[PDB]
Symmetry: C3
Subunit: 359 residues, 3 copies
């Protein structure tokens, strides 16, 4: 190899997408966690998730209908509540007593739908709830532009390695990482970055390329990352938020999603034109990661240099989600920090940048 | 789960389709029973089935030719009789002596081709021969309109559960089952039905919907069902026969077939126009089952109500085909009958029908 | 069955195609031997092969670039020499010391690229080097017209059985084998053939069909065959060379390739017109084998007649490549010859040829 497959899917919150796309006003089928899931909303507009296959004789609940607070199976119309309780068998003398299917705990946060997953079958620790993003509810920000792809032939765990790599900021995103720090603690892993645009990549000048980016990116649990993007072109500031999230479909396939909201420029003219530019731009930055992730294997026992930083400590952090809560080791979870020195690399890269535009 | 896969394919007769489609005058390839099969007719027009792969060096006999009473392998022209005997190697000094491949016992019944399958390798019990349908040879009836699909991702055993379910007649076929009885005995499982058209499903009236259907449906062995359809619209009677049959390709894929013949209306004008309407109509009734079967799992340990009827007894009946003939249990095979009470359901359903057209 | 899958890929030289197609001047991805391979040339134009996945964090080297004598990984630009040595990590203070990936020994012979494979991980025995074909470097011959297909659902070992079969020359290639001899010795298996065109296959005459073909075909190791084709139409001689070669992708899939060069006719008129006819013609002869190979299984325990010749001795020869060099048995490798008597078959076939054109 590199790498024996996980035997479970990770314990945590997984984002299924934009909440308003699961509300129309039918059930939705999602394949996830090696099964099929049914997603549907209440008569109160509250979102529920169940095993997708009817416990009676196997009808696909996602092919059925919402009737009041229950999804009705397409086959014989039995009625399943968001808590999994069989509420009614319409034509029967006696609805089964205290029957239920598996229900999944759900959370709507920042206009996004999350489901909880735990192999051990325990409910969500309140301590690991996904944070609200205030700007998702601001009329001063755009609303989620959201994308999703299916990646086959790898495990979702392959993509989290990005948290820890300073050097790809140059080769993949075409900037110069001038500051690089990782923090792991509890259920959160973070990356803090200062990045400068490269002069040799067509937005130079001189005196007219020169974006500076300050980035904080955090994983809140195993699968969901918020990235706060503050960049500048001199004195022109722009603010954005990129969501990088995934959920496993299989141990060899997963859905990768990304969303972007931007602080609307005031403005102007509508000003939608310029927000599309800001959005498509963060989107293209994400898509440069996808190109790599799409054509790469995971390396279980990597050849590492000092500049790799905290690769092992990050993999140790991520293990916590795959062990029973009772088996979590201090060192998975205790505060770890590392600043990666980017000064030699930056002098090498500036030399290569210089070398390139001397032509 | 629901359900550990069978380790054998069922012992019995399996229909391969309309006999006249296997007669033209070449061999035919069929994948079935986890292998490849070759089908071909005699110089007497008698139909034979063999393992499809030549015992010499593996040529695909279905890619070859019929020469007299033998199929000639495309590779080196060896000649295989319908009983599996190597009859000739044309260029050789000495044809192998008492060499053979596996041959499959065949039956042409009602213009349909059947092959026999038994894991134990024993020949067909005469007691289980598939019955003749006289109307398949009547010029007073239409001839087989026949359809076939490949279902991937399930086992063929999933579809036989339909024999025992009264309630889908309402939700799936949009009628009201007014009488419902099952009989299992020997190698045959039967369903007897009286069904009334629903007023809320656009053929009402009042006084102008109102079909009454009397249905007898029997499985003759594991895979082949004849359904006798007698319905009325007042005094206008119509007669039809639906064949529901399948054969396994793999333990996770099978071919589902259906054929319909109708009693031709006298007539009239040709009268082909009206026979097409009668045929397409039974066909669409079958296709409503297919929609369910296409998007459903089998439930091995189902949540059952009283109205489910004889679900366990039917699964016990079907087991007989998967055990060695010597291991068949009395209770698989002894006469079992159940009438399912449809009176409460029918009052519930009439209320819902009433509720619907009050709008 | 027929046949338990090999547990290794064969020890020997495998042809990857025309060397000039791997030189342009980027790396190439090839799937082979159950992995992914990267192919690239030097700054000296010398061709190298490595494991395709970067040992750092798994980037696909075939998606990267050639920089001097090394392929640069697309992910972080590490630099890998044709011998597998990590030569530089560009941005790092310290390149890893004495780090390497797996490199594959390479050979350019007759304008074709070969890679060496050995489960035991030993280098190429000089004794088994693939011979030069002088005519591949002659301006009196055409240059490689080359074709490649992917065969899924079989093992590459299935096709080598052709070496030993006289009778397919009639049924598959439509000629009459008048002389047939096999020689196995060491790492080489050979077929010597005299073939006459069939009168009943539209190039008769009389006095105007009547090609005579003298053929020598040799496997040099497990996967690569040169076939020298000398045929005549009376006094008009033509010379060609067909390469039949393959490499395994998986134990159930492989790439089959074929190339043809012809002695250019002098000439004439350009004379390219006639060389295309000669080439397309050998190509179509090869393609008649492919039709069989595409629709056939391997038979592990075949029903054989005397006319089958040395089927077992050929399979025993081929075993050598699948055992450890230390475990090769005398009888795999010692000189074996057999002439197959084609006289009775030829009288049978002439009778059938006669029978056919009497119509
Ligand atoms: S299968 Fe769901 S109601 Fe019967
Ligand atoms: S493979 Fe069937 S005749 Fe040789
Ligand atoms: S993955 Fe190849 S250089 Fe890092
Ligand atoms: Fe990135
Ligand atoms: Fe039905
Ligand atoms: Fe051949
Ligand atoms: Na790093
Ligand atoms: Na029922
Ligand atoms: Na032979």
């Amino acid at each position: 190899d590199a790498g024996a497959l996980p035997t479970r899917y990770a314990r945590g919150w997984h984002c299924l997408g934009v909440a308003k796309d699961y509300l129309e006003g039918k059930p939705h089928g999602v394949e996830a966690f090696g099964t099929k899931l049914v997603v549907f909303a209440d008569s109160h507009g509250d979102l529920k998730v169940l095993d997708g296959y009817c416990r009676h004789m196997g009808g696909d609940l996602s092919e059925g209908t919402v009737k009041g607070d229950e999804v009705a199976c397409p086959f014989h119309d039995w009625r399943w509540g968001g808590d999994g309780r069989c509420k009614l068998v319409p034509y029967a003398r006696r609805t089964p007593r205290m029957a239920r299917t598996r229900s999944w705990t759900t959370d709507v946060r920042s206009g996004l739908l999350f489901v909880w997953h735990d192999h051990e079958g325990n409910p969500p620790d309140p301590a690991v709830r996904i944070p609200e993003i205030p700007e998702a509810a601001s009329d001063e920000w755009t609303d989620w532009r959201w994308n999703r792809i299916l990646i086959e032939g790898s495990n979702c765990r392959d993509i989290i390695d990005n948290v820890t790599d300073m050097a790809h900021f140059f080769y993949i995103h075409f900037g110069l990482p001038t500051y690089f720090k990782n923090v792991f603690e509890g259920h959160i892993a973070s990356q803090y970055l200062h990045n400068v645009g490269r002069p040799d990549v067509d937005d130079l000048g001189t005196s007219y390329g020169e974006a500076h980016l300050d980035s904080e990116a955090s994983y809140f649990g195993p699968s969901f990352m918020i990235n706060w993007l503050h960049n500048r072109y001199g004195n022109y500031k722009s603010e954005s938020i990129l969501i990088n999230c995934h959920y496993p479909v299989t141990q060899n396939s997963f859905v990768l999603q990304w969303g972007v909201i931007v602080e609307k420029p005031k403005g102007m003219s509508m000003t939608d034109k310029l927000s599309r530019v800001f959005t498509e731009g963060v989107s293209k930055g994400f898509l440069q990661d996808v190109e790599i992730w799409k054509h790469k294997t995971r390396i279980d026992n990597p050849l590492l240099v000092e500049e790799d930083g905290a690769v092992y400590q990050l993999r140790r952090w991520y293990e916590q989600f795959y062990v029973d809560v009772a088996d979590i080791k201090p060192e998975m979870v205790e505060r770890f920090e590392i600043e990666v020195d980017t000064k030699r690399a930056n002098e090498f890269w500036n030399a290569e940048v210089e070398k390139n535009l001397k032509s």
